[PDB]
Amino acid sequence: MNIFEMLRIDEGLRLKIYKDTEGYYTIGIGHLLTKSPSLNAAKSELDKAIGRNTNGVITKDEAEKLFNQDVDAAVRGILRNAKLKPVYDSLDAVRRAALINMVFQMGETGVAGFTNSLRMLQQKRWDEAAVNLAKSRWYNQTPNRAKRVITTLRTGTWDAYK
Ligand SMILES: [Cl-]
Ligand SMILES: [Cl-]
Numbered sequence: 001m002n003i004f005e006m007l008r009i010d011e012g013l014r015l016k017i018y019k020d021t022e023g024y025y026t027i028g029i030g031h032l033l034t035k036s037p038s039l040n041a042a043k044s045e046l047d048k049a050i051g052r053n054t055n056g057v058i059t060k061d062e063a064e065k066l067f068n069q070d071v072d073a074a075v076r077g078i079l080r081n082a083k084l085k086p087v088y089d090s091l092d093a094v095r096r097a098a099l100i101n102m103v104f105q106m107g108e109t110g111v112a113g114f115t116n117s118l119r120m121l122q123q124k125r126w127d128e129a130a131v132n133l134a135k136s137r138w139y140n141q142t143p144n145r146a147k148r149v150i151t152t153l154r155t156g157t158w159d160a161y162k
Contacts, residue, residue, distance in 0.1 A: 028063030
C-alpha cells in the first residue's frame with residue numbers, strides 16, 4: 001500500500017465533472033476544479049488544466065496525470081510549510097502518507113491550522129492526537145474517511161485500508 005493507492009481508495013475516480021462532498025466542482029481523483037457554482041466556470045478550469053477543449057469529460061490517463069501533479073504539489077506544500085515540515089520530518093513512512101492525505105484533501109493552510117494535533121503528533125502521543133483530530137469539522141463531515149486517516153496516524157499501519 002502506498003500514498004497513491006491510499007488516495008485512490010479515499011477519492012475514487014470519476015471521468016466526468018462531478019460535485020464533491022462540499023458541493024464543489026471536481027473531476028478525476030479528487031481534483032478540485034473551482035469553488036464557483038458555475039458549471040461553466042468549471043469546464044473552463046478543466047480545459048485550462050488539461051490543455052484541451054474537454055466538454056467536461058477526460059480520459060483515465062488525464063485523470064492520472066492530474067493526480068500525479070496533485071500528490072507532488074501536496075508533498076511540496078508540506079516541505080515548504082514551516083508548520084508542516086517539522087511534523088513530517090519527525091514521522092515514520094506510514095504516518096507521512098497520512099499527513100499527505102490530509103493535505104491533499106484540505107490544503108496546506110487547513111492542516112497547518114490543526115495546531116494542537118500537530119504538536120501531539122510531533123511528540124508521538126498517538127492516542128491523544130487521534131482523539132483531538134476527531135474534534136473537527138473534517139471528521140464530522142467525512143467521518144469514514146477521517147477515521148481511516150486517523151487510524152493510520154494512531155497506529156502507523158495500513159490496517160484501515162486493508
Ligand atoms: Cl492544474
Ligand atoms: Cl466519509
